[PDB]
Design a protein around this motif. Structure first.
Motif, PDB file in Angstrom:
ATOM      1  N   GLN A   1       0.808  -1.213   0.000  1.00 52.29           N
ATOM      2  CA  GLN A   1       0.000   0.000   0.000  1.00 52.29           C
ATOM      3  C   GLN A   1       0.845   1.270   0.000  1.00 52.29           C
ATOM      4  O   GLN A   1       1.223   1.760   1.062  1.00 52.29           O
ATOM      5  N   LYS A   2       1.138   1.790  -1.192  1.00 52.13           N
ATOM      6  CA  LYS A   2       1.924   3.015  -1.364  1.00 52.13           C
ATOM      7  C   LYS A   2       2.630   3.046  -2.715  1.00 52.13           C
ATOM      8  O   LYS A   2       2.448   2.157  -3.547  1.00 52.13           O
ATOM      9  N   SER A   3       3.433   4.084  -2.928  1.00 54.08           N
ATOM     10  CA  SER A   3       4.186   4.230  -4.166  1.00 54.08           C
ATOM     11  C   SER A   3       5.643   3.906  -3.859  1.00 54.08           C
ATOM     12  O   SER A   3       6.554   4.360  -4.548  1.00 54.08           O
ATOM     13  N   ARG A   4       5.840   3.113  -2.810  1.00 52.58           N
ATOM     14  CA  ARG A   4       7.165   2.700  -2.360  1.00 52.58           C
ATOM     15  C   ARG A   4       8.110   3.861  -2.109  1.00 52.58           C
ATOM     16  O   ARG A   4       7.680   5.003  -1.944  1.00 52.58           O
ATOM     17  N   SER A   5       9.401   3.547  -2.069  1.00 54.82           N
ATOM     18  CA  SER A   5      10.446   4.537  -1.844  1.00 54.82           C
ATOM     19  C   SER A   5      10.212   5.364  -0.588  1.00 54.82           C
ATOM     20  O   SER A   5       9.553   4.918   0.350  1.00 54.82           O
ATOM     21  N   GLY A   6      10.764   6.575  -0.581  1.00 55.36           N
ATOM     22  CA  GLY A   6      10.614   7.455   0.561  1.00 55.36           C
ATOM     23  C   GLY A   6       9.222   8.046   0.670  1.00 55.36           C
ATOM     24  O   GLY A   6       9.054   9.265   0.662  1.00 55.36           O
ATOM     25  N   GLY A   7       8.221   7.177   0.772  1.00 55.69           N
ATOM     26  CA  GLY A   7       6.852   7.638   0.886  1.00 55.69           C
ATOM     27  C   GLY A   7       6.454   7.880   2.329  1.00 55.69           C
ATOM     28  O   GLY A   7       6.242   6.935   3.089  1.00 55.69           O
ATOM     29  N   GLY A   8       6.354   9.150   2.707  1.00 54.52           N
ATOM     30  CA  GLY A   8       5.979   9.487   4.067  1.00 54.52           C
ATOM     31  C   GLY A   8       5.985  10.982   4.322  1.00 54.52           C
ATOM     32  O   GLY A   8       5.058  11.684   3.919  1.00 54.52           O
ATOM     33  N   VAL A   9       7.033  11.457   4.991  1.00 58.73           N
ATOM     34  CA  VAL A   9       7.201  12.872   5.327  1.00 58.73           C
ATOM     35  C   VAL A   9       6.122  13.791   4.757  1.00 58.73           C
ATOM     36  O   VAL A   9       5.243  14.250   5.485  1.00 58.73           O
ATOM     37  N   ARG A  10       6.194  14.059   3.457  1.00 58.88           N
ATOM     38  CA  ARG A  10       5.218  14.919   2.800  1.00 58.88           C
ATOM     39  C   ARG A  10       4.996  14.502   1.350  1.00 58.88           C
ATOM     40  O   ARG A  10       5.861  13.887   0.727  1.00 58.88           O
ATOM     41  N   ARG A  11       3.826  14.845   0.824  1.00 60.33           N
ATOM     42  CA  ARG A  11       3.456  14.522  -0.547  1.00 60.33           C
ATOM     43  C   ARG A  11       4.496  14.987  -1.564  1.00 60.33           C
ATOM     44  O   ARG A  11       5.397  15.761  -1.238  1.00 60.33           O
ATOM     45  N   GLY A  12       4.365  14.511  -2.800  1.00 56.77           N
ATOM     46  CA  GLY A  12       5.307  14.873  -3.844  1.00 56.77           C
ATOM     47  C   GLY A  12       5.024  16.185  -4.552  1.00 56.77           C
ATOM     48  O   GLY A  12       5.695  17.187  -4.302  1.00 56.77           O
ATOM     49  N   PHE A  13       4.035  16.178  -5.442  1.00 55.42           N
ATOM     50  CA  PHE A  13       3.668  17.374  -6.197  1.00 55.42           C
ATOM     51  C   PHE A  13       3.466  18.600  -5.312  1.00 55.42           C
ATOM     52  O   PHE A  13       3.527  18.516  -4.086  1.00 55.42           O
ATOM     53  N   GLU A  14       3.235  19.743  -5.949  1.00 59.83           N
ATOM     54  CA  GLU A  14       3.025  20.991  -5.227  1.00 59.83           C
ATOM     55  C   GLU A  14       1.956  21.832  -5.917  1.00 59.83           C
ATOM     56  O   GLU A  14       1.362  22.720  -5.307  1.00 59.83           O
ATOM     57  N   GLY A  15       1.719  21.544  -7.193  1.00 59.01           N
ATOM     58  CA  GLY A  15       0.727  22.287  -7.948  1.00 59.01           C
ATOM     59  C   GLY A  15       1.365  23.061  -9.086  1.00 59.01           C
ATOM     60  O   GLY A  15       0.697  23.420 -10.056  1.00 59.01           O
ATOM     61  N   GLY A  16       2.663  23.316  -8.959  1.00 52.38           N
ATOM     62  CA  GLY A  16       3.388  24.045  -9.985  1.00 52.38           C
ATOM     63  C   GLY A  16       4.422  23.159 -10.654  1.00 52.38           C
ATOM     64  O   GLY A  16       4.073  22.271 -11.431  1.00 52.38           O
ATOM     65  N   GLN A  17       5.697  23.392 -10.353  1.00 49.25           N
ATOM     66  CA  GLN A  17       6.773  22.596 -10.931  1.00 49.25           C
ATOM     67  C   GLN A  17       8.079  22.808 -10.164  1.00 49.25           C
ATOM     68  O   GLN A  17       8.104  22.711  -8.938  1.00 49.25           O
ATOM     69  N   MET A  18       9.161  23.096 -10.883  1.00 46.25           N
ATOM     70  CA  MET A  18      10.459  23.308 -10.251  1.00 46.25           C
ATOM     71  C   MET A  18      10.919  24.768 -10.301  1.00 46.25           C
ATOM     72  O   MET A  18      11.386  25.308  -9.298  1.00 46.25           O
ATOM     73  N   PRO A  19      10.775  25.439 -11.459  1.00 46.00           N
ATOM     74  CA  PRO A  19      10.235  24.903 -12.707  1.00 46.00           C
ATOM     75  C   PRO A  19      11.214  24.988 -13.875  1.00 46.00           C
ATOM     76  O   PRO A  19      12.357  25.429 -13.729  1.00 46.00           O
ATOM     77  N   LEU A  20      10.735  24.556 -15.035  1.00 48.05           N
ATOM     78  CA  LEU A  20      11.493  24.569 -16.281  1.00 48.05           C
ATOM     79  C   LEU A  20      10.504  24.892 -17.392  1.00 48.05           C
ATOM     80  O   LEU A  20      10.878  25.371 -18.464  1.00 48.05           O
ATOM     81  N   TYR A  21       9.234  24.619 -17.114  1.00 48.96           N
ATOM     82  CA  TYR A  21       8.150  24.866 -18.057  1.00 48.96           C
ATOM     83  C   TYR A  21       7.375  26.075 -17.541  1.00 48.96           C
ATOM     84  O   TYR A  21       6.728  26.790 -18.304  1.00 48.96           O
ATOM     85  N   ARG A  22       7.456  26.285 -16.230  1.00 50.18           N
ATOM     86  CA  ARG A  22       6.779  27.389 -15.559  1.00 50.18           C
ATOM     87  C   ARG A  22       7.736  28.555 -15.323  1.00 50.18           C
ATOM     88  O   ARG A  22       7.308  29.668 -15.020  1.00 50.18           O
ATOM     89  N   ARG A  23       9.033  28.290 -15.468  1.00 49.05           N
ATOM     90  CA  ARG A  23      10.058  29.310 -15.266  1.00 49.05           C
ATOM     91  C   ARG A  23       9.665  30.628 -15.927  1.00 49.05           C
ATOM     92  O   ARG A  23       9.114  31.517 -15.278  1.00 49.05           O
ATOM     93  N   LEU A  24       9.957  30.747 -17.218  1.00 52.74           N
ATOM     94  CA  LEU A  24       9.635  31.953 -17.971  1.00 52.74           C
ATOM     95  C   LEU A  24       9.371  31.640 -19.443  1.00 52.74           C
ATOM     96  O   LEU A  24      10.069  32.139 -20.327  1.00 52.74           O
TER      97      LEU A  24
END
Lengths: 99, 140, 198
Positions: free
Chosen positions: B35-58
Motif C-alpha cells: 500500500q503506497k508508491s514505495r520509496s521514501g513515501g511518508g514525510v510529505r506529498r510529492g507534487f506541489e501544484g506548480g513545478q520546479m520549474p522549467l516549463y513554468r520558469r519563464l
RNA sequence: CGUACACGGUGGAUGCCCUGGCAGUCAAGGCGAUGAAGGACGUGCUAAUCUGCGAUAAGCGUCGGUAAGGUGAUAUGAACCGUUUAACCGGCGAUUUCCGAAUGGGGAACCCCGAUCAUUAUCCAAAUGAGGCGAACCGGGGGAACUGAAACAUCUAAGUACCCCGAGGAAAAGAAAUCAACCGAGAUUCCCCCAGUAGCGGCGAGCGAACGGGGAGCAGCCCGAGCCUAAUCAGUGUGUGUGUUGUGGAAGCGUCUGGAAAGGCGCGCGAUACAGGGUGACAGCCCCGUACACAAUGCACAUGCUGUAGCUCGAUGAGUAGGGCGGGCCGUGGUACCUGUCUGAAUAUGGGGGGACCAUCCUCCAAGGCUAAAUACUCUGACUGACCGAUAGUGAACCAGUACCGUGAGGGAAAGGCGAAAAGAACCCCGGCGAGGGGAGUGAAAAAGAACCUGAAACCGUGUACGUACAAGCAGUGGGAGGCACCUUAUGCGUGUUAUGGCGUGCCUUUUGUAUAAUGGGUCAGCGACUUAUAUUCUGUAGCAAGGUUAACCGGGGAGCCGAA
C-alpha cells in the motif's frame, strides 16, 4: 401476585392438600405457608428442608408453581382467603375473574 | 403472530449501487501490507501544484487582462421563431433562457425556418444581416 | 397505463396512477446491494479539519501526529490514518450512483406499475389504528404474502403496521430506494404515489 | 531427564451476565454578608465506611398524596414505632449552638468587635454601596513564542495561548453625513450565497472582504420653549398553556424437560400505548413501566385597571471636519480603523460621502444618547444510542480520585457474579497446632464452598504410553526389515511408540552479500501501527443525454457552476 395475607393450597409436594396462611414471602420466589413444617432433632415444630448439615434456613421452601391461590381455570382447588379498605380491590374481589 | 418474525426492523429495503462489500471502499486494510508508491513515501506529498520549474520558469508567458464587458450571449435563430411570435426586442427575453445580468449578445443561425419576427439585440454579425431582411423586420 | 387502487375492503378498483421509467430489474436488484447497513461509519482518506498544535503545552519529545479529540487520525501509522496508497479513501466496498442510485430511485417507482408486484391503497389506510385490520386488508387483498415483502405509505409513519412481518415504515418524502422495495419488493398507498411522483 | 496424554493443583483467559461508562437528544438553569459554594467536626442501642442531617443531628412541624407495614445502603442481634393511621413521596413553615468570605484585632477553626474604601449625611456609619462564588458562553483592554515561509529580519502561527476589568442569561451592534447594479435599496446583528472573486503579498509562499441577493427576526425614538393631557413613570389587581405523586388499569394457558421457565412445541392476545427492567433459566399479553388519567407547587412571561398623561414650534452638539509628524492594527492597497504630539474650518445662501487629488452632479448630513426580537453551553432532570464491556469503557460498574507517592504544586492504581433458598465445609481421624485433609457432606445447567459461575495457555505434581547412563545432532521422507502395545470406525486396512540405516547448519530485519562473532526477542495471552471537509485530475460501472446538476432553505429552486466555437 402473592401476598402474606393470603391462604395457599399445595397440589404437588408431599404436603398436597394442606391448607394454611402465607407466613412470609422472600425475594427468592419461595413462600412458607403456616402448616408445611418439618420435625427437627429435638422435635421442634419448625419449617425446614430435609437435608443434613449445620445451620440452614427455616421454611419448607414452597413454590408458587405448585401452589393454589386464585387460578382462572378448571382445577380441583376450592375457596381461598384474600384487604378491603381499598374499595377498588373489592370490585375485583367481587368479580369471578380477579381479586 | 406472536412468533419472532423472520425479520423486519432497520436494515430493510434497497441500498445504493453495485454489491458494495462493506462501507465505502478502502485500499490499505488494517495491519501491514505494501500500500503506497514505495520509496521514501511518508514525510510529505510529492507534487506541489506548480513545478520546479522549467516549463513554468519563464516560457511564452502573458499577463492578466482587464475585466471584459462579459457580450457573448447566444441568441441563435429558431427556438425563438418556433416559439412565441412577434415583439422580441429588449423587453421580452426573460421568458427565454436569454437574460444575463450583464449586457449584449449575438445571433447564430442555428436554423433556417422563417418566422419572420424582428429582433433588436444591440449586436450583429454575418447571417444577422441575412434573414430578418429577406423575411422582414429591422435591426435597431 | 392505469394502476388500480384498493380500499380498506381491498375493493377490486378505486382510482388510478402510474410512473414512467424503464424498469431495470438488474439495476433495482443492483440497488438492494449497497447499504442496507452501509452507513455504519466508513474509513475514508482526507475529509476533515485537522489543525496542527505547533510547539508548547506539555514537555516531551513528540512529532507531528494527527490529533482529533486526543484521538489519532489521518496518520497512516495509526488506526484510521492516512492511506498512502490513495484511490479507495474509505473501507472495502466494491468497484462501483449518479444514475444507478437515482436512476434506480426512478426505475423502482416504475416497478410498481408491474403486474407481479405491489398495489396502491386508498388514503384511508393511514387511518387504521389497529394492526390486525392490516393483516386482514392484506389477507383479503390476496397479498398476505406481501408481509413476506415489506410496506410503506404516505403522510406520517404508519405505526399500525410497524409490527407486521417485514415492515420498515417510511414516508413518501425522503424514501430512498431502500423502503421503495425491501428485497426487490414493496407496497405503497395512494397519496404516497403522488408525493413520490415529484 | 526427553515428549504426549490422563487425574489434581496453580493461574486466570475465554463464553455468558453486568446494578457502569461513552455518545446523542429534549427539558430546565444561578447561589450568597436574612453570611452561600466548599471544607472541618458531630449525629443512629452497637456502626468502622458511605449517605442523610447536624446538637429537637440519617431527624422535628403543617397540608396534601399514600398506605400497613415501617426504623437509609448490610437481608445481624437487641429493640422501637404505626389505626391518637406511621414508613415513604411532594410542597411549605418553625428551629437552626460555636467557628466560619464575617470586616474589630490576632490566629493552622481559638479569644475580645460593623475593618477598609465610598455616597448621603439629622455628619450620629445614622441610613446605604462595594469587598466573595459560579461550566462555558459574552463585552472592553494588554498581548507572545516555538512553528510555517522545509534558513530568515516583512509576512505566517496571533490577533491565538496567557494576563487585567466587567455584565447577563444572554451579551455586543443599531437607526445610517450608508449603499450606489439605480427614475433604486434603505436600522442593526446572525445563517446561506455571492468569493476563495475584488484586493494584499521577496506579488514567493500564502493571506482574503464587501455591496447585492435568498432567509431568520422586525421599532423606533430622546435632549430649548408653548400648550395640554392617555408616550412614560409610580402603584394595584393578577392569567390561559403547568411541576410531582396517587386514583379509573386486561393478563400462567396446555404438553414435555427441570429444584425452578422468562425453554422446546401448540394456541391466543396488546398496539392514537411494536423502550427498558424486575419476577427461581431468551414472558410486549406475570409486576412495574411505555400511550393515558388526576391532584399538590413553582413560574405565573401577558393582559386589565388607577393616577400620571397628548400634542405643538425652532434648533440640533469644534478643538470636531480636515492637515502634518511618529506608531499600532487591518484584506486596506497614496483608497480601513484607532492611539499619541502639533496645527486647525465652515456652518445648511453650509458641509460630508459615492475605495485616488482639485473645481462642477446624485445621496446623505457627523463631532450627544437610548433601543425588544432571531443562535451558546450543559452542572441539573428525563430519554436514546447497528457505541464498550470490567488488562473494554470515564482514572473510578467492587474503599477511588480511595490505597499509595512527593516538602509542595502535583501524581495516582488493582479488586465484578455461589445460588431457588441457604449453603460457603458440620461430624470423625491424624498432627505441635482454629496454620498441612483422607473421608464425608453441599450441587440445578453451580464438570459450586467463603475473591465461590465457566475456567484455557505458560506451568507443577502423580501416573500412563515410550525411549533412555556409546551416544552425534532440524531430529523428515521413501524403501525394506524388528519387536512391543490397542482390534468404538469388521475387509492382507491403521495408530502410540521406538530400535537401526541412508540424508539434514532455528526464525526475523539491515545489506552489494547475513546461517554467520550485523541488529531484535527468555516464554505467554491481551494490547499495538494506514482516517474524518472540500477542491482538482484520471480510471472501472451504470441511467440519460447538448443539455446536465444543483447549493442555503421548501417533496420547490437553477442562484450559480461546467459544457455548447
Amino acid at each position: 401476585k402473592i401476598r402474606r395475607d393470603d391462604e395457599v393450597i399445595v397440589l404437588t409436594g408431599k404436603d398436597k392438600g394442606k391448607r394454611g396462611k402465607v407466613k412470609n414471602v422472600l425475594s427468592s420466589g419461595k413462600v412458607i405457608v403456616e402448616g408445611i413444617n418439618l420435625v427437627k432433632k429435638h422435635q421442634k415444630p419448625v419449617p425446614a428442608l430435609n437435608q443434613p448439615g449445620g445451620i440452614v434456613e427455616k421454611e419448607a421452601a414452597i413454590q408458587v408453581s405448585n401452589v393454589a391461590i386464585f387460578n382462572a381455570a378448571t382445577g380441583k382447588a376450592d375457596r381461598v382467603g384474600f384487604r378491603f379498605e381499598d374499595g377498588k380491590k373489592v370490585r375485583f374481589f367481587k368479580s369471578n375473574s380477579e381479586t | 403472530n406472536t412468533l419472532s418474525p423472520a425479520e423486519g426492523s432497520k436494515k430493510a429495503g434497497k441500498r445504493l449501487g453495485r454489491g458494495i462489500g462493506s462501507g465505502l471502499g478502502k485500499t490499505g486494510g488494517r495491519g501491514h501490507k505494501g500500500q503506497k508508491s514505495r520509496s521514501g513515501g511518508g514525510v510529505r506529498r510529492g507534487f506541489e501544484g506548480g513545478q520546479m520549474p522549467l516549463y513554468r520558469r519563464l516560457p511564452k508567458f502573458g499577463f492578466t487582462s482587464r475585466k471584459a464587458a462579459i457580450t457573448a450571449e447566444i441568441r441563435l435563430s429558431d427556438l425563438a421563431k418556433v416559439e412565441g411570435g412577434v415583439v422580441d426586442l429588449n423587453t421580452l427575453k426573460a421568458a427565454n433562457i436569454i437574460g444575463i445580468q450583464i449586457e449584449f449578445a449575438k445571433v447564430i443561425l442555428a436554423g433556417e425556418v422563417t418566422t419572420p419576427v424582428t429582433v433588436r439585440g444591440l449586436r450583429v454579425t454575418k447571417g444577422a444581416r441575412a434573414a430578418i431582411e429577406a423575411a422582414g423586420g429591422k435591426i435597431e | 397505463m392505469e394502476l388500480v387502487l384498493k380500499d380498506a375492503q381491498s375493493a377490486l378498483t378505486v382510482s388510478e396512477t402510474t410512473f414512467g421509467r424503464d424498469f431495470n430489474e438488474a439495476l433495482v436488484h443492483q440497488v438492494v446491494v449497497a447499504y442496507a447497513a452501509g452507513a455504519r461509519q466508513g474509513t475514508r482518506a482526507q475529509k476533515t479539519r485537522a489543525e496542527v498544535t505547533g510547539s508548547g503545552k506539555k514537555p516531551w519529545r513528540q512529532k507531528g501526529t494527527g490529533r482529533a479529540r486526543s484521538g489519532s487520525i489521518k496518520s497512516p501509522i495509526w488506526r484510521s490514518g492516512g492511506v498512502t496508497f490513495a484511490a479507495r479513501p474509505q473501507d472495502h466496498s466494491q468497484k462501483v450512483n449518479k444514475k444507478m442510485y437515482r436512476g434506480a430511485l426512478k426505475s423502482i417507482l416504475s416497478e410498481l406499475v408491474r403486474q407481479d408486484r405491489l398495489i396502491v391503497v386508498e388514503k384511508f389506510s393511514v387511518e387504521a389504528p389497529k394492526t390486525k385490520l392490516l393483516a386482514q386488508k392484506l389477507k383479503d387483498m390476496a397479498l398476505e404474502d406481501v408481509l413476506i415483502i415489506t410496506g410503506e405509505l404516505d403522510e406520517n409513519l404508519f405505526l399500525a403496521a410497524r409490527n407486521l412481518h417485514k415492515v420498515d415504515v417510511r414516508d413518501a418524502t425522503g424514501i430512498d430506494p431502500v423502503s421503495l422495495i425491501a428485497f426487490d419488493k414493496v407496497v405503497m398507498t395512494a397519496d404516497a404515489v403522488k408525493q413520490v411522483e415529484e
